[PDB]
Design a protein around this ligand. Structure first.
Ligand code: HEM
Ligand SMILES: *[C@@H]1O[C@H](CO)[C@@H](O[C@@H]2O[C@H](CO)[C@@H](O)[C@H](O)[C@H]2NC(C)=O)[C@H](O)[C@H]1NC(C)=O
Ligand SMILES: *[C@@H]1O[C@H](CO)[C@@H](O)[C@H](O)[C@H]1NC(C)=O
Ligand SMILES: *[C@@H]1O[C@H](CO)[C@@H](O)[C@H](O)[C@H]1NC(C)=O
Ligand SMILES: *[C@@H]1O[C@H](CO)[C@@H](O)[C@H](O)[C@H]1NC(C)=O
Ligand SMILES: O=C(O)/C=C/c1ccc(O)cc1
Ligand SMILES: [Ca+2]
Length: 595
């Protein structure tokens, strides 16, 4: 029944068998099926795609075509009715540092990307979608409902383009449309080094034979590195301030400069890599360039896996952590490590942890200057506030001392992102991340909220009352039921995020199920997982077991006052200890006597 498979726009797969390092494309991780968990392959489908025409059109494309008997609500109306809120007071998460939100976006980025289809450069098609809001082909305009304030100041719609899809990049009509995952499903640091050989090398500094990742030669941070700029025009980091004229950064992942704190976390990672490569050279001066890069790359990948799985995942999953992520039992080659399509949506829960402002803090963690605190939207693709305004050291203090937004049923997504998002090649701070998310669900042909509840062994509410009992919220149930006239139709994104938080965790039962499963697969089906016997030496594993985000800060910034548990709420100077009382990553176990 299920064919051997389509694979036109994907090259050859030739796997070096002795190779002890990962490939940049992620290819060859799994021996029996070497394309599993590799960039540029279709996202996996845990459940059949659901499309309007059961092939490729998204629901809500043909006004006359209903879903389960009903019309799907406009993405922006749902957003306006449910997602939006005015009052930023009392919305901070008392037990999560803002670093909690940041680590989430870092991991999400390392895992999946599903970029839009290409048909817009040297073609004005991109402007024809924007200008006349005509739905066609890839252009899938997010229309404004009747009472929208944006109707008055912005037009009839918000531009939107369908995500790219495997095999043909013009419409094919036999198997359902499968979108592409442009990065490697492995927690490999793809976001630091690249997912394409072509990027991966450019990012490198091949001049010196020291295995360094190339840095910015135009500007520094107290003698500390900055990612190289990307000299591709037009640049949104230039468009936001045309007087400053500072371009976006060049990183392993394309979206690195979308907001200043991600740009910031990317800055810390590159530094650790360089810091590692210099430390290794000293111990093993005989090591060639490649070895230094690979060994360094290998370590940072382990670092991300420990932080994410030991410190991050448990505070996201809490009570459900063990249920889906039992302690490691070793590599299983029968585990599918490909990121599933719906996970790329489950993981957007992070969007409700983004608060309306960002601050810069001095050495006693106090307001750094006149405008230490800034509105989040002035930070989208803002690179000049880092180079021209104090380095990352101030911003990394805000990441430790401020809180993330708490998910709230009456306050889901802050307007900075809801009304004011900036998208490249478009001119305004006037977009909606919520609306986009919803439209993306439909574009990916996502099954409704009950299919996913079914998928997780949870009940499937069919009535208003049924929904209320699940969400533990009358008014929220009433609104959803008014917009989608049946739970069966609630877009997974808004659906999963409406459930209350499970104990000790920051997501509901449905997302804990979907997230947990994926991460469990990420770990168990990855031949190069740091704790998988034989990847690192038992001694090395003991060295690694001691890493901490605090340590990464201390090593890569001039901050000497960090908390111990980076992800929880920590105030200064009480919960802050000197860096010396914090374990280091002793790299001695990497000495290589070959005499
Ligand atoms: C300032 C903070 C953030 C901004 C500005 C931001 C922005 C965006 C944008 C513009 C998209 C593309 C929307 C589309 O599909 O067209 C996106 C997608 C996404 N976001 Fe975020 N985001 C932020 C934080 C987060 C966080 C904290 C998480 C998780 C903790 C997260 C998870 C995701 C995921 C999983 C995707 C889909 C990636 C894919 O296409 O595979 N985001 N975000
Ligand atoms: C564009 O970037 C410039 C350059 O930093 C910003 O200009 C500075 O902002 C304040 C003045 O209000 C000063 O402290 C800096 O010295 C200024 N530099 C210059 C050359 O004016 C400016 O605020 C940014 N503009 C926007 C719209 O973001
Ligand atoms: C490459 O490495 C050399 C030696 O450390 C350094 O001086 C040079 O600036 C680096 N080049 C880039 C682009 O990073
Ligand atoms: C390996 O994966 C398969 C499929 O997920 C599963 O049935 C099997 O139990 C796994 N092996 C172990 C040791 O759990
Ligand atoms: C804060 O979070 C940590 C985990 O980061 C947890 O162990 C601690 O008990 C939490 N505090 C409260 C008040 O829940
Ligand atoms: O164009 C870019 O550089 C990136 C935009 C973006 C898309 C998804 C994100 O999660 C963050 C930024
Ligand atoms: Ca990856």
């Amino acid at each position: 029944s299920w064919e051997v498979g389509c694979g036109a726009p994907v090259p050859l797969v030739k796997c070096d068998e002795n190779s002890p390092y990962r490939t940049i494309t992620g290819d060859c991780n799994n021996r029996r099926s070497p394309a599993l968990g590799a960039a540029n392959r279709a996202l996996a489908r845990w459940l059949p795609a659901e499309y309007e025409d059961g092939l490729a059109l998204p629901f809500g494309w043909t006004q006359r075509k209903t879903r389960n008997g009903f019309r799907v609500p406009l993405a922006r109306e749902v957003s306006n009715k449910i997602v939006g809120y005015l009052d930023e007071e009392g919305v901070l998460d008392q037990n999560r540092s803002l670093l909690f939100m940041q680590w989430g976006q870092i991991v999400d980025h390392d895992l999946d990307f599903a970029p839009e289809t290409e048909l817009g450069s040297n073609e004005h098609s991109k402007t024809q979608c924007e200008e006349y809001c005509i739905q066609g082909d890839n252009c899938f305009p997010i229309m404004f409902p009747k009472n929208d304030p944006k109707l008055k100041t912005q037009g009839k719609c918000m531009p939107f383009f369908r995500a790219g899809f495997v095999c043909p990049t013009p419409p094919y009509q036999s198997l359902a449309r499968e979108q592409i995952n442009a990065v490697t499903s492995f927690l490999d640091a793809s976001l630091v080094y690249g997912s394409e050989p072509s990027l991966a090398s450019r990012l490198r500094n091949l001049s010196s034979p020291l295995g360094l990742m190339a840095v910015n030669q135009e500007a520094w941070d107290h003698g500390l590195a900055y990612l190289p700029f990307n000299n591709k025009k037009p640049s949104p980091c230039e468009f936001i301030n045309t007087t400053a004229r500072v371009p976006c950064f060049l990183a392993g992942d394309f979206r690195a400069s979308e907001q200043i704190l991600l740009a910031t976390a990317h800055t810390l990672l590159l530094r650790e890599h360089n810091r590692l490569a210099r430390e290794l050279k000293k111990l093993n001066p005989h090591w060639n360039g490649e070895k230094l890069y690979q060994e360094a790359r290998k370590i940072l990948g382990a670092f991300i896996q420990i932080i994410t799985f030991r410190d991050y995942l448990p505070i996201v999953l809490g009570s459900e952590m063990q249920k889906w992520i039992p302690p490691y039992q070793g590599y299983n080659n029968s585990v599918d490590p490909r990121i599933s399509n719906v996970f790329t949506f489950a993981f957007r829960f992070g969007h409700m942890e983004v608060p309306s402002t960002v601050s810069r803090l001095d050495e006693n963690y106090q307001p750094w200057g006149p405008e230490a605190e800034l509105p989040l939207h002035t930070l989208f693709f803002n690179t000049w506030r880092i180079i021209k305004d104090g380095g990352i050291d101030p911003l990394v203090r805000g990441l430790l001392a401020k809180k993330s937004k708490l998910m709230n049923q009456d306050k889901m997504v802050t307007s900075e992102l809801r009304n004011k998002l900036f998208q490249p090649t478009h001119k305004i701070h006037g977009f909606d991340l919520a609306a986009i998310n919803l439209q993306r669900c439909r574009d990916h042909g996502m099954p409704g909220y009950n299919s996913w509840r079914g998928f997780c062994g949870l009940s499937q509410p069919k009535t208003l009352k049924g929904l209320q009992t699940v969400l533990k919220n009358k008014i929220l149930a009433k609104k959803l039921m008014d917009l989608y006239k049946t739970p069966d139709n609630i877009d997974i994104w808004i659906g999963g995020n409406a459930e209350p938080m499970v104990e000790r965790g920051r997501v509901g039962p449905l997302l804990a199920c979907l997230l947990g499963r994926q991460f469990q697969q990420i770990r168990d089906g990855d031949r190069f997982w740091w704790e998988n016997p034989g990847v690192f030496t038992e001694k090395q594993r003991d060295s690694l077991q001691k890493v901490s985000f605090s340590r990464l800060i201390c090593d890569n910034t001039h901050i000497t006052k960090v908390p111990l548990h980076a992800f929880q709420a920590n105030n200064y100077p009480h919960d802050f200890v000197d860096c010396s009382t914090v374990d280091k990553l002793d790299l001695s176990p990497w000495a290589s006597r070959e005499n």
